Amino acid sequence: ATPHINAEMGDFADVVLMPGDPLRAKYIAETFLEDAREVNNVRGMLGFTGTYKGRKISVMGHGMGIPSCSIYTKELITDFGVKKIIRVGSCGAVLPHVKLRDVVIGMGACTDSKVNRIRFKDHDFAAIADFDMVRNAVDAAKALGIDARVGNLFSADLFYSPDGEMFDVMEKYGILGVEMEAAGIYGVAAEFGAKALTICTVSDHIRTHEQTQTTFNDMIKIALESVLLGDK
Amino acid sequence: ATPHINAEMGDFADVVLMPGDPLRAKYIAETFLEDAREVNNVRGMLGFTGTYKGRKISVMGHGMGIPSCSIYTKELITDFGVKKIIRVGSCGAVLPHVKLRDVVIGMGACTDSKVNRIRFKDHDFAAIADFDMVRNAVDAAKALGIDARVGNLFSADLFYSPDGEMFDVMEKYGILGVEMEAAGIYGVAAEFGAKALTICTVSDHIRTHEQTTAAERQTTFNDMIKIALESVLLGDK
Amino acid sequence: ATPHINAEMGDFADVVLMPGDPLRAKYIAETFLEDAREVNNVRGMLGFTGTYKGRKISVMGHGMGIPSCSIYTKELITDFGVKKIIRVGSCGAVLPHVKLRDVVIGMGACTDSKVNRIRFKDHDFAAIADFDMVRNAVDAAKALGIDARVGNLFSADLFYSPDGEMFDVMEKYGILGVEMEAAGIYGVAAEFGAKALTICTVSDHIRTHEQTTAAERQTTFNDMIKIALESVLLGDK
Amino acid sequence: ATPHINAEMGDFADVVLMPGDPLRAKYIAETFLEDAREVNNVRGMLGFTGTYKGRKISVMGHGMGIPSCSIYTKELITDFGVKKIIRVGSCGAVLPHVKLRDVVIGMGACTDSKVNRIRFKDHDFAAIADFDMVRNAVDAAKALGIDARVGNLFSADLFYSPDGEMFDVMEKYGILGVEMEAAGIYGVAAEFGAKALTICTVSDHIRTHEQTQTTFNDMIKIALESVLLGDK
Amino acid sequence: ATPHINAEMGDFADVVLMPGDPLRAKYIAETFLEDAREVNNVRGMLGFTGTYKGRKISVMGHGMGIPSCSIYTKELITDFGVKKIIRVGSCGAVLPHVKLRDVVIGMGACTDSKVNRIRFKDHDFAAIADFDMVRNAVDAAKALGIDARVGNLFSADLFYSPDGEMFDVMEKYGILGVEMEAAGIYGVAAEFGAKALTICTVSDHIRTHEQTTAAERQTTFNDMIKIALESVLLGDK
Amino acid sequence: ATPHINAEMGDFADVVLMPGDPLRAKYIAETFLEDAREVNNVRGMLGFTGTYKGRKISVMGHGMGIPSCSIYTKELITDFGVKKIIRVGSCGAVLPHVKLRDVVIGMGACTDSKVNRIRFKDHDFAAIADFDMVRNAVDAAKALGIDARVGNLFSADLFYSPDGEMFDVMEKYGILGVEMEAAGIYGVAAEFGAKALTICTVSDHIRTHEQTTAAERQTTFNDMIKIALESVLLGDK
Numbered sequence A, D: 001a002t003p004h005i006n007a008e009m010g011d012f013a014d015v016v017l018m019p020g021d022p023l024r025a026k027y028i029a030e031t032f033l034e035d036a037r038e039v040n041n042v043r044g045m046l047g048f049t050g051t052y053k054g055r056k057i058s059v060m061g062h063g064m065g066i067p068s069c070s071i072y073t074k075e076l077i078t079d080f081g082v083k084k085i086i087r088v089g090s091c092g093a094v095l096p097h098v099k100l101r102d103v104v105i106g107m108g109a110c111t112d113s114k115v116n117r118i119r120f121k122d123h124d125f126a127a128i129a130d131f132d133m134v135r136n137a138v139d140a141a142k143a144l145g146i147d148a149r150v151g152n153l154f155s156a157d158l159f160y161s162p163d164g165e166m167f168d169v170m171e172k173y174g175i176l177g178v179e180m181e182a183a184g185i186y187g188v189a190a191e192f193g194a195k196a197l198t199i200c201t202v203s204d205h206i207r208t209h210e211q212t213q214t215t216f217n218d219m220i221k222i223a224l225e226s227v228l229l230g231d232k
Numbered sequence B, C, E, F: 001a002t003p004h005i006n007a008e009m010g011d012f013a014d015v016v017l018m019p020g021d022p023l024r025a026k027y028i029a030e031t032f033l034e035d036a037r038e039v040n041n042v043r044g045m046l047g048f049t050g051t052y053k054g055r056k057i058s059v060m061g062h063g064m065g066i067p068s069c070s071i072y073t074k075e076l077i078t079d080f081g082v083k084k085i086i087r088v089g090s091c092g093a094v095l096p097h098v099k100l101r102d103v104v105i106g107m108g109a110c111t112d113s114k115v116n117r118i119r120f121k122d123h124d125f126a127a128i129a130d131f132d133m134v135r136n137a138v139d140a141a142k143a144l145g146i147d148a149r150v151g152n153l154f155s156a157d158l159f160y161s162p163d164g165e166m167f168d169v170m171e172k173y174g175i176l177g178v179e180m181e182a183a184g185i186y187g188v189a190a191e192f193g194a195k196a197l198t199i200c201t202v203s204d205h206i207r208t209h210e211q212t213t214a215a216e217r218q219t220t221f222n223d224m225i226k227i228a229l230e231s232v233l234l235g236d237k
């Protein structure tokens, strides 16, 4: 048991999918996993372990924001033997040609946070994902027949930003989605030695303002299927 | 109803108490509020509204970290007409004479986050509480025979710090407690024109550990809540 | 004797009043203190020590700007055993509802200076006053039938700033007054473990100014000192 | 003709390989290209255009450092219709298990420069390469039977750094190679809309101090071969 | 009349000498200038105007620290038509080969202040003196048989810095002396299109200090003024 | 022999002139130096050594940008015993009265690069030239009947700026010319204890273009070199 997770070494698989919402994790366990059982409930952060096509898999929420997800991804890596972490969240689009329900794969993640500058002597650390994992996900999407854009994400500290002009800069630099965790997960994976990847479903559009724990299944199917490709 | 709070105008009181753990909100509602009702459950962040000695009061969790609590407090203030927000949590101690189960009141809050510099043109914005609320809390604590320290808190962005260098620095400058929300909540209150206050009970001490008892810790957590609810009543007068 | 203060331990009281204008020290000594005696004159910064209603008190100017008052407040604290510093000055307002001659008490102080970042490993240090001292001032004021505003102050490094947009930002975040010292003094207090407070009267309203008679100005200045002095006795209780 | 390049639209191919040394470009033109001809010589920055297996290809040096290579990559993209840029340079290793002659592919690039902060409102821009290009290079290396590590590079402003302790941070975060251009090329590709990739040969070791315009052929072969995979 | 200088266009010469110690102005006026008359006394900052070998010249203190001298140098330049500012003060040395009482001329000034970054969109602005003024000073000194060191100065915001390692760094990069104004004055000069220069005598040697008689000190101070004054006449050619 | 310069101790003179273009080094060697010989060719950055009026002098290119010229100057100073480095290049003008073919001398150099902050603990290091060298250049220019401005240069990291905002700022603060090396060369000289100087001829004007003639431009470039070589001779005396 750790400060934020009440479980023992072995309760989690070496691979864990992590949505920001605890209720979506529960839903993923009920819909995609077999013989699924609850392994954690402290502070309401539901965690589950089960099987997908004979493969042991875990799924647990991580809360909103870098500070919250940094705590959980670190504890799993250092005390529960987790090797791979795949974040399956939602994001906001800034580009004109990006529409709701689109699937994005974050090869990299920009941020307005200071966490990585605190780790890198105040210089620029390129927060990137594991190449193999990115590739496994791309191959899984193709096999499933689902479209998916690979590119940069932007991890925001303020969902309600006081500076809207920064969206112009994001668009100019081809940012595919705005969320609040990627850059933090990638910094942790590198500090504590593990591999990570973030997959997101465009759930709203920052320019047009159109919006949408259920129904984001293609994202899940790609993630689970990409894990098996990695096992081979 | 916003993307994070599925409720309507009137479902929340103009005063909201906010713990970090959503399960703690249910504990508070069940223990101190009368005629309580659930007003939100999105993402599992339970909210409740009831009354305390005839006063309408609400209690809802905010999650861990400045990014999380900044979303909730912001929506409460701009979409549900909330005027006061009081955070009630825990923190770690760095000062030798600050002991476990001590009640700390955050008049100010330092931080390693960059959100207030983004707001303040890259300068130093002193994140502070509302004077009157601090005052009402100090007076409420006294009426209950409880001791309370008033000073600076530190809102950390990384629970697990890469370099344990800041602990010596915080101690050298008198920081009373280390948590993860105060600075962000004070920034939101200033930006949208509302009032806020943070109260914490020392749950752990970085500078040499040495715990106490379960019944004693739980007595102190209840006193903190008692101080919060009673401070509100004094303010109504 | 220190580099900027030629005196010995015991010449200053444990409480010192400090105006920005050096010429204000002699005025205060002969107008409010009893049995005053001179204790400093290095570089022409005259210091005095006497009593107010039996209480031992000292007064001496600090000069304009953070760098200057940092030198004086620090030498007093580490070499003359001073426990409390109270700055008494003027400020400019940016809020429409804040009028000329208003008395403001700075619970916190924002700044564009780098002194605190140099102290706090380039992070955000909330420079705040001592809570009790703030409360003592508020109560002393009420007793004199004067209503004081408590809030954030902004300590500027450039009286003539190249960019004027920062004023809109200060107004948006509730800054009560603009001056040039508070954040420096609060930083020093936290560094050497002492207590500080800044009280100011609005002497000008940046953007849309008014007009004041010399008689009005001395009346307000005297009220501020009276407030500062009575707050010390309240604190002694 | 541009301020730093004396040529006309059409003199360069839509793809250009760029080593830092002008003499290595000349060597690459003589050794790998057919019917190669000089297209530029201003300030000594030799540029050449020719063919590789019937495919029109260009090769031109860019000088040392981000400021120098920023000028050249920008002019090629805006006035000569260049679509892809592949940097083929050398680097210094910091990790124990990395040895001379090893080939590295930069999926990302960290830096202590301020150029990207000047473009991104002083926030953290993740300087990454084009996914397809990275993948084409990985596939080419496998087909050639050459080993190649994919990861983060570090673009230094000071070859002779006053802070050696920063090498500890680099090593801790898995930096595969230290050079002086990647982060700059990736920022330019994004600003002016083109694709880029950096390939480097470990030419020295920062810890052991062992050192090495010729002989770095595997790097070249992978780059040229990866371009053809991209054409399909 | 300006906020800090109660005078009118024409009361100050187009060249002003400014010491850090306000008490130095009256001394200089009666010891080096002819037919001196008082032109300022606001806040006790006394200013004088007279002639030196027929040339019109003024003297007035600026107070310790960048914020203070920025106010005075700027009002003189924009409201009284001053074209040249020469600071005459003291500094502390960090280099072994720089001895007590040495005269140093600051061609450039480093700093830990943020004033210039605020002016230069957070980039590096090289705060430098006017080349001719520097050369005039070097030649005036030689003619008086005094060899002056020309180089970099460092303007500190904190006389008592929390970190002492910065001194090793200053020594490594050749800093000749440590003071608290030059970078502020040079910034103002560049902002309002005027000329400036800082001349200083080593009054203390940080780390490994020596000892000086009061007689030695006045001799050196007088030499510096003599150097500053003769440099102005050379420049008039 | 280093990884960038394939030569031995004695192959370079203690004074090296450095243009940005390697082809320009050959032009200078062929035009002004007697008995010249090539001493380096690595990466194509040609170096030469010969004599001017019996004085041994070297000339080698440094490439574009601070990262490039920082490598070469550093190796020359620490591995080839070079004492003086004079950069001779071109720059763009921002000031209205600075006209094409004007000779600018960089007493100081501002920059948007971060290399000097990495060296100076994140503070402001004023990147300046060696006084005597500036002086020798001003005196050499005069003996040839040439006019020369002395002031600040700006070393840019991006030739093609993302935001043309800094041009107005540079102009407001009096920058004489825009190039890409000065600040980095001055930083290297300070770090390894050598002397440096940058001289430029205005090759273009951002503020409204309007060129001249080829024969006239080339006459001015030669005068600059003449000023450089002659300034060295004065220094030998």
Ligand SMILES: Nc1nc(F)nc2c1ncn2[C@H]1C[C@H](O)[C@@H](CO)O1
Binding pocket: A020, A063, A064, A065, A089, A090, A091, A092, A093, A156, A158, A159, A178, A179, A180, A181, A203, A204, A206
């Ligand atoms: N427009 C948007 N902006 C940001 F910053 N995050 C967005 C988002 N749309 C979805 N998300 C994801 C990330 C957070 O966990 C959470 C915030 O509601 O859901």
Ligand SMILES: Nc1nc(F)nc2c1ncn2[C@H]1C[C@H](O)[C@@H](CO)O1
Binding pocket: B020, B063, B064, B065, B089, B090, B091, B092, B093, B156, B158, B159, B178, B179, B180, B181, B203, B204
């Ligand atoms: N030592 C400590 N450090 C930090 F950063 N936060 C502490 C804490 N002790 C308690 N807390 C409170 C604040 C967070 O919401 C939450 C983090 O577990 O509990």
Ligand SMILES: Nc1nc(F)nc2c1ncn2[C@H]1C[C@H](O)[C@@H](CO)O1
Binding pocket: C020, C063, C064, C065, C089, C090, C091, C092, C093, C156, C158, C159, C178, C179, C180, C181, C203, C204, C206
């Ligand atoms: N508008 C204003 N702006 C600033 F920066 N300071 C102001 C002021 N009005 C009064 N003060 C106080 C503070 C300094 O000691 C001094 C500066 O003249 O008087």
Ligand SMILES: Nc1nc(F)nc2c1ncn2[C@H]1C[C@H](O)[C@@H](CO)O1
Binding pocket: D020, D063, D064, D065, D089, D090, D091, D092, D093, D156, D158, D159, D178, D179, D180, D181, D203, D204, D206
């Ligand atoms: N150890 C090293 N450090 C840095 F910064 N760059 C290195 C290098 N080894 C090779 N390079 C590459 C990049 C430059 O273009 C050039 C510098 O000599 O060659």
Ligand SMILES: Nc1nc(F)nc2c1ncn2[C@H]1C[C@H](O)[C@@H](CO)O1
Binding pocket: E020, E063, E064, E065, E089, E090, E091, E092, E093, E156, E158, E159, E178, E179, E180, E181, E203, E204, E206
């Ligand atoms: N060691 C020293 N450090 C600093 F920061 N300033 C020094 C000094 N010695 C003299 N001075 C000059 C500059 C200020 O006006 C004033 C500060 O006492 O005198």
Ligand SMILES: Nc1nc(F)nc2c1ncn2[C@H]1C[C@H](O)[C@@H](CO)O1
Binding pocket: F020, F063, F064, F065, F089, F090, F091, F092, F093, F156, F158, F159, F178, F179, F180, F181, F203, F204
């Ligand atoms: N307008 C201008 N801007 C910048 F940044 N540099 C300029 C220039 N005009 C000439 N130069 C000099 C300096 C570089 O070495 C080189 C860049 O082409 O020539």
